DNA sequence: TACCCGGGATATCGGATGTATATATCTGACACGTGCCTGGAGACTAGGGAGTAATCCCCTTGGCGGTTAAAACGCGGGGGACAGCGCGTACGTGCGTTTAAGCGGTGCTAGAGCTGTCTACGACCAATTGAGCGGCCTCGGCACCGGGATTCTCGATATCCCGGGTA
DNA sequence: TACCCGGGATATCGAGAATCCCGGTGCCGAGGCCGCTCAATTGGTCGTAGACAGCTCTAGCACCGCTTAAACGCACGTACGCGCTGTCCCCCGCGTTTTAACCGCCAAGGGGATTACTCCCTAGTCTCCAGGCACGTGTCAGATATATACATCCGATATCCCGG
């Protein structure tokens, strides 16, 4: 029964996803979330497909830059585990 | 001796209308003047951008209203749009 | 309510793209919160532009103008 | 010779706002509802900030608004802080903020 | 005698279209002639630099068609193009292959 | 069927002049078009601001030159000002 | 015996004293010499209004005070109370000022 | 060379205004570096505006326009 | 080996230091009046940007069948985050010494800041034509399936050199 | 005690899962050709924006003398940074089972967009005049010296508690 040590598949995935360019969030649940959030601003809103694709591109770019800053906060705290402490520190130093 | 325009007397008028006994120094008057210029430029900028987006060449009250709803955060937008619409009604129905 | 559609593997993939090796368990709800706030800011502005155009369909140009106003310029969708 | 400020019930000049919207090269045409509405908005923001600043001057037992009072008036309100987050006010300093972990 | 100003100025980007965008865009009352020639020259130079670095990164990837990923690498591996486009998201580009040192075994 | 203007053929011409064998996809062409529009708007914006500061109403080559020296970081500014001045000389001394 | 406080008490006393004041903390004249020295490397024989140097000093002090605020939050985050150049570099990197 | 005119007590006062309780010794040189880089960026832009106005005196409006371009709007000096 | 006395952690009040609250003085900066002039206002006309109606066809939404990649649910374990401990070193506090930053003057002059003149450079208008865009097409570069080389991971195993109780 | 037994850490290899490279095949989007239409160009005309000369007078820069405020340096001690170690629990890899994301195909209609037509709102001119600004003058808000009260905060100490 082969089993890797903890850490090796994580680093393998870090490499696989830093080489790839495809969208990581699934398309349809993100679309439902966007329509749900829009609902609380105007009823009966329609959406071009490219509008939801643009929202998804920008949302994923934002969350990836956020996890990069969060990883730098974790490393700064002598840890290899990201924590909600780290996300809150990142957004605070970033000014959000 | 070129007359430099300012908002100083108008800020002083609104200060007397909100606090009749409190005066104001000249440095705080400079800060209020720069605040007024800044917010002016911000709103007129966003309104010009809105007019360019919609293939229009006339800045009307609707552009300023949507610029205020974009730029002011939340409750400041709600009260200012109300105040602004009030002043345009009083303007369009005056003698 | 559809915020759970942002699954735990999807947040893990996003973290992998950011280079994160190890992820604690309380991250996922926190991340759902932050993404929810981001889309709130962006879609509000986009809906405002739709309101001003007297239209009922939110175009991609509206989302581009909105992200650009917020200082996050997106290339590849026009404009 | 009734000015447009008094006609609209305002204090900020509608004529100066209108000629700054004309000279500033923002569009080809500029209406009449636009400078009235914009003077109204500007008057409201000046009113709100000078109100909070007179309050902070009263708390400090003074009857003259200084820069420090504008600083406190802006940074203790949430929406004016969001409005003026990227703005430095000179001669204002900062809020009296001391972190909890530094206290004995 | 219908020689265009693009060819007259030794450039490729249209000086006429730049000039009519400076007029339509409501930037000033008067617009000279040196302004759209100079601005078309600047725009041509930046497009040249970006497509140069992007063809290099496409060649290094053994590809003959520049994709978004190649523009991403071309911009983010250059320092001054990164300073120019620091707050700009390129869609379908991803990120650089960056792994921190402390995470390695 | 309204003709939507673009910079696509001009980007393709400069690509053939810098890499004769490499083509380009349509998504990268959209990204280059948006890059050109963006840098255009940035430079024309800063130039308009410069003209308003100096109480001027004419955007000349000097305004675009100082806008480029402000907006482009370092060596990109040095090479582009050179290239731009070259094109204005060739323009002002042509037939 | 000569009286002496423990480490920390005068620091907190000064924190309170300077968070109440609004005056400029850097001396005027050495900052002016630094500003003229840096300007020298861009154009020779430049002159400066007095308000120009005061504006430079106002913005520089506001910038360094916001920077030390973020640096203190990084230090506290690392279960420390002493700021370090690691902390300044982390702050400037996350804030985007590194380049 | 005049960068030492930014003294150790002045950096300590600035840190006190930021709320810092304890300061390590390597801070001071690091801070001299960061301030030097900040003024470099700002004065370069201000000098550019002076160059464009064909003048020899750097006005306060030049420094205000420069700080504003860099996203740090300064109130109280005109504009 | 029992009494007396030395070290350590955690409440208490004296007492030393800095700090918030009471008067007196003196200022100089804010508030207010005056001349005046330049930008705001009133009136009138032209036209072209914008509102509105009709049309039409694009594309956005809703629904169904399958199928298959992905998400959800649990096992087991190690490895990393979290509480406890000691060192040393390097900062913070206070004391004397001393370096220079501020204040107050005048002198000078380079250069900002206005005024009048005047031409050349750009807006505006009409003709014309060719460059740039919609539509079409074909074909080769990219996507994709499969196999082999390779490339790092991880366990099993032989081997090793330092100190607490077995035979 | 010197034993042969026994826990910590090192190098070394070989199975083994994963990934890169290499051919082989299809397919669809990028490059290229053609009509045409509308915006780039050329020629001409005024009007005024800006370049230029001259004058002024403002403030920006060098120069000295006191004056303490603050920077500099040194001793010292203690409190915090950091390394070590021990625990445990939480997250990570992996197998199995569920499930909804995706494709693809089709259908109905909402509204995006386009064109035409009228009409009225603003740009522009001209004339008049009064509100806003520069300038001058008073006066009191507050900055500045000194005087006692009112919180901390640190050490002597008050007593608890073991120990060499």
Numbering used by the authors:
A (entry chain E): 38 to 133
B (entry chain H), F (entry chain D): 28 to 122
C (entry chain F), H (entry chain B): 24 to 102
D (entry chain G): 14 to 117
E (entry chain C): 13 to 117
G (entry chain A): 37 to 135
Authors' text:
Polycomb repressive complex 2 (PRC2) is minimally comprised of four proteins: enhancer of zeste homolog 1/2 (EZH1/2), suppressor of zeste 12 (SUZ12), embryonic ectoderm development (EED), and retinoblastoma-associated protein 46/48 (RBAP46/48). Structurally, PRC2 is organized into an upper catalytic lobe comprised of EZH1/2, EED, and the C terminus of SUZ12, and a lower regulatory lobe containing RBAP46/48 and the N terminus of SUZ125. One of the key biological activities of PRC2 is to methylate histone H3 at lysine 27 (H3K27me), with H3K27me2/3 being most relevant for repression. While PRC2:EZH2 exhibits a higher intrinsic methyltransferase activity for chromatin and is allosterically stimulated by H3K27me3, PRC2:EZH1 has a higher affinity for chromatin and higher chromatin-compaction activity, suggesting that it may be more directly involved in gene silencing.
We incubated this complex with nucleosomes containing ten base pair (bp) DNA overhangs on either end of a 601 nucleosome-positioning sequence and a histone octamer containing two modifications: histone H3 mutated to methionine at lysine 27 (H3K27M) and histone H2A monoubiquitinated at lysine 119 (H2AUb). H2AUb is deposited through the activity of another polycomb complex, PRC1, and enhances PRC2 activity in part by interactions with JARID233,34. We incubated PRC2:EZH1 with the modified nucleosomes and generated a cryo-EM map at an overall resolution of ~7 Å. Interestingly, our reconstruction revealed a dimer of two PRC2:EZH1 complexes bound to one nucleosome. We used signal subtraction and focused refinement to improve each component in the map individually and were able to refine the nucleosome to an overall resolution of 3.3 Å, one PRC2:EZH1 monomer to 4.1 Å, and the other monomer to 4.8 Å. The model shows that the two PRC2:EZH1 complexes bind to opposite sides of the nucleosome and engage with DNA near the locations where the histone H3 N-terminal tails emerge from the nucleosome core particle. We observed clear cryo-EM density consistent with the H3 N-terminal tail interacting with the catalytic site of EZH1. In our lower-resolution maps, we can see density for the DNA that becomes fragmented upon focused refinements, suggesting that this DNA is flexible. There are at least three possible reasons why we do not observe density for H2AUb.
